[model samples]
Target: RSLQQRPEPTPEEWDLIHIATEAHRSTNAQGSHWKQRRKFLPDDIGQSPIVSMPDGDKVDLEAFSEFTKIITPAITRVVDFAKKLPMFSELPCEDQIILLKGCCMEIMSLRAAVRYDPESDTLTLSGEMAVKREQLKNGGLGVVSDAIFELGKSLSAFNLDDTEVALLQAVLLMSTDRSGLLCVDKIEKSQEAYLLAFEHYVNHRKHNIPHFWPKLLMKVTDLRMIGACHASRFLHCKVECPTELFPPLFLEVFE
Candidate 1:
């Protein structure tokens, strides 16, 4: 007999799924026009004030540490699930380490984008910081994070090959871009400046460590498609409710 019923999604699951759906829908509605607007926008105006010290200011390690403390548990909870998947199991031990490292790097990169302040010692979530928060609140990170975790779990269920697993990981990384974190030029109107600033941001976030970022470009050549698929699945499963057609479907009918 079919299972009597699927348990109701937990509150945490509901929140993650809701955010994921919103992120995808907003991205779809905005389209390339939104990207174009973002590209042209100046990044300097929204920056937090730099904290001055006798020598120089640095990122408030204490504040960053606290922030990580808040988000790390949620992130790791999902990662733990991914680790158990069969797809990840098929990879050589070394490759699995690489995958784990890459996943951690990606999460840290996102946190840096949202919270890092080069000039100040304080981690304030205001202005552009607020924008980043909205991104997270809207489920941008949560959705992507959950999608990747789910993909890993699903792959494990199917016994995927190393290359296939690698491809899946690649898709997760490239589907989301960190350019939104870098500060763009205010006065200059040159792609070179944008690229340079972005590179500098990447280097700073990676602590000048080469090979810190997985080979995302080469690995996921079709990021656009990957993004679309990820977003679509997220929305359909989480947001597109059939209950709209009959509001009483969830009214707990009695026999």
Candidate 2:
């Protein structure tokens, strides 16, 4: 559907939109394949009082491990999301690998933003498990968790729906600017296609809000910033946390 002033997406653009939305929906964290532990409520959950020691609050390995169990599978889901994009699968294996590696964190952050529940001030990992900001921060995610909460809350303010987030994920995954790309031109064209679709799709939904699309794109930069902090924090995890504590998939992707 197109407004008289706003241009409607062309047939090809609709194709891109459908693929991205489907890919994202199929692989999102809420999918039935990922089992979830029982959800925790703030009132019944008796908390341990913190006594700051010399080493800072003792790393809550239990909480951290719980967080990891949920997040680790998301890496695989991200890859699955990428692979579902026709343009991404068309690239050479090595090039596909590079692009996946480059944008993994960005897309993950986008998903995190999508899953963020602003009303409750929590980010849901699954149907069952939704975590508060303090929960993740104290769970050994530290400042990076705070950054995620802040970004998620900010993006959640825009109130982007699922399809919009999926298109953004496609746009990020199709980046030509990533280092070591062998198919830069091919990727650039793909990114342009998805971006154009994103613009039309978002505008169609929010025609009243001028320049709203740019605000959504700006979150890509926010995602990148979160990505950097994410890397360093995981690296710290590799050193500080026991090797046995992390999922191998998590280590392979982030470490």
Candidate 3:
């Protein structure tokens, strides 16, 4: 017997979905070139050799410095994506920064998770740089890299489409519980809209996957763990290394 029909998204929810999808598509590391090529090669293309690193080594300061440069642009794109959300931009200016700063690492982790290829245990950055798990750890990410790959492995099992990823990112971005939010109610209301839209879309589209919604929501805890790891590790690096290696944007947001 066929299952009952699920509720479709409301018109307002559709609007939020549309906005989120467009924003994610544009700001994602995979540009049009990567998207076009991805059709033919579904998994990672142009993957590099998994370079070996010595066991029990300390942070590779030089490699980690290079890693920071590679990912710095992503911070800009995250801000751009947040601005695309009408509700986010309409918040008080200070609140906007607060939210972005609060969730920047989480959003970045989510984006990276979707790019993870479990088979090879690599994250395909910008659709070209196929970075292996060992590389990230060797480059000083350590346990942070381990957690990210674990998250990526877990998420890949669900096979989330781009729209799902976008909505989830938006939901995290609009969180109202950040420490410095001045307009918590407004942010909370905006978060509710995204949450409703996320729930409706997932239920409508993935009704057959039992308890998928709850499982997806559960990943929020995972994201928070990753965020905390990133903050602690990044701060440690800032204190130990020269400031020039770290991007000003990263410093402003997390430091």
Query: Which is the leading candidate under TM-score?
Result: 3
Off by over 4 Å in 3: 1-3, 31-57
Name the better of 1 and 2 by lDDT: 2
lDDT for each residue of candidate 3 in 1-255, tens digit (9 for 90 to 100): 013466668888988999999998888876545533432222232133232333333465555655677666878889988999998888889999988887888988888778777666677655656667766666766678889888898887787887888888898888876787788987888888898888888867764467888899999879978888877777666666677877787788888
Measured over all alpha carbons after superposition, the RMSD of each candidate to the real structure, in angstroms, is: 22.9, 3.8, 5.1
TM-scores of all candidate predictions against the true structure: 0.26, 0.85, 0.86
What 10-residue stretch in candidate 2 is worst by lDDT? 44-53
Question: Which residue pairs clash within candidate 1?
Answer: 86-156, 87-156
Output the lDDT of residue 91, model 1. 48
Model 3 whole-model lDDT (C-alpha atoms): 0.76
lDDT of 2 at 63: 70
Clashes of 1: 2
**Candidate that beats the other on TM-score, 1 or 3, i.e. the better one:** 3
What lDDT is reached at residue 192 by model 1? Answer: 33
Per-residue alpha-carbon lDDT of model 1 for 1-255, expressed as tens digits?
112332333454334333333332332222223322332112332233232222232222233232333443434432443344333444455544434433443432322222322233112221122223222222223344333333333223233222222223333422223223122232122223322333232333333334532433332333333344433433442332233321131111100
What are the runs in model 2 whose C-alpha is more than 4 Å off? Answer: 1-3, 31-38, 41-58
lDDT of 2 by residue, 1-255 (tens): 576677678887888898899998888765543235426535322134242323353346557667677766778888999989889898998898878777888887677656677667877664457777777666765666778788888775687777888888888888876678888898898888888889888767864455787777788888877777777666766776667988887777775
